[PDB]
Amino acid sequence: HMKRDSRIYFDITDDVEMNTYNKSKMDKRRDLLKRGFLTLGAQITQFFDTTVTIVITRRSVENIYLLKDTDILSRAKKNYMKVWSYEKAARFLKNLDVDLDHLSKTKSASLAAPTLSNLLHNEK
């Protein structure tokens, strides 16, 4: 049970470069977050506009001040919407006792991207 009329927009723009497969995986995480919120009674908007209350983004929140005024993240801060990273969004869901792994048919650890850090752990 979430706030009455939460309207969540998922930012579609990235500010990091990544390979095709890693991009696909980020989209899977996005979709998983989406079912999570749908389950809490959120409305997931297709467009960004002034009726949006929460924006969920893969971009640098700390560096929003450096973006153009027309950027949805700028407009979101200006309108006092919450701006969350995927990680913070996931924390929020967990805090409301949503079990993300119960939402998918596939493994939710399958959405981790551990390769490089595993090669570093092994090298060390």
From Swiss-Prot:
Leader peptide range in chain numbering: none
UniProt modified residues of type Phosphoserine: S117
The organism's place on the tree of life at top rank: Eukaryota
Induction of the gene: Cell cycle-regulated. Protein levels increase as cells begin S phase and remain high through late mitosis.
Modification after translation, per record: Phosphorylated by CDC7 and by CDC5.
Subunit composition and interactions: Heterodimer with CDC7 to form the DBF4-dependent kinase (DDK) complex. Interacts (via PBD-binding motif) with CDC5 (via POLO box domains). Interacts (via N-terminus) with ORC2, ORC3 and RAD53. Binds to ARS1 origin DNA.
Function summary: Regulatory subunit of the CDC7-DBF4 kinase, also called DBF4-dependent kinase (DDK), which is involved in cell cycle regulation of premitotic and premeiotic chromosome replication and in chromosome segregation. DDK plays an essential role in initiating DNA replication at replication origins by phosphorylating the MCM2 and MCM4 subunits of the MCM2-7 helicase complex. DBF4 recruits the catalytic subunit CDC7 to MCM2 and to origins of replication. DDK also has postreplicative functions in meiosis.
Protein name, per record: DDK kinase regulatory subunit DBF4
